[PDB]
Write a protein that binds this DNA or RNA. Structure first.
Length: 181
DNA sequence: AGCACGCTGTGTATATAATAGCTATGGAACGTTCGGTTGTACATA
């Protein structure tokens, strides 16, 4: 009905290697590594070809983020593991689970936020002197939507690409019902 | 050099994994500092 498909903007994927790393060694022998143990307990590393960031912890756990596609995250995570391998550490690609997907879109018309905040009060929270966007907590699929007056919708919380589409197709009608003017 | 205006970073809201470090918060204990004369017998000269 809508005819517009939301576009994914970020994918937070987590990977494990099953081995203990020495963060200082990784920071000193990796191209772009930023290890500051005083603030955080991981070495932050970036690569350019998929443009993703990785938080590599001392327990062999990795948190890749920034990929725009489900497969691109796999390529980024694989390259990060390979870089760790080329250092010499025992690193093997292992369980890869996408823990969060963020998508954005626009319905192309203003939305009366005061309406959703009133009609849908059990899901929507509208406190406009803190954040200019209404927060809709959909119950099935369990996804959080940020609805803005300019007609822009942000989808976050989906674990697969299907739920983020399902949420938008279920939110378009109630959004159109509250079109200003 | 002070005032108006543009640009840029910071905060606030949402989801999520990972980790280590500090904070509350009850529960238990120990140490220091406040609220004779009188009168009658008796035995002997």
């Amino acid at each position: 009905t809508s005819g517009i498909v939301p576009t994914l903007q970020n994918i937070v994927a987590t990977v494990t290697l099953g081995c203990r790393l020495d963060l200082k060694t990784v920071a000193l022998h990796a191209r772009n590594a930023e290890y500051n143990p005083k603030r955080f307990a991981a070495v932050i590393m970036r690569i350019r070809e998929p443009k993703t960031t990785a938080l590599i912890f001392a327990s062999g756990k990795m948190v890749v983020t920034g990929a725009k596609s489900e497969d691109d995250s796999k390529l980024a995570s694989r390259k990060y593991a390979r870089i760790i391998q080329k250092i010499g550490f025992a690193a093997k690609f292992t369980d890869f689970k996408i823990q969060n997907i963020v998508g954005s879109c626009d319905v192309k018309f203003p939305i009366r936020l005061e309406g959703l905040a009133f009609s849908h009060g059990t899901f929507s929270s509208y406190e406009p002197e803190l954040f200019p966007g209404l927060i809709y907590r959909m119950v099935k699929p369990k996804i959080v939507l940020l609805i803005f007056v300019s007609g822009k919708i942000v989808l976050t919380g989906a674990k697969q690409r299907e739920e983020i589409y399902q949420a938008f197709e279920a939110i378009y009608p109630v959004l159109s019902e509250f079109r200003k003017m």
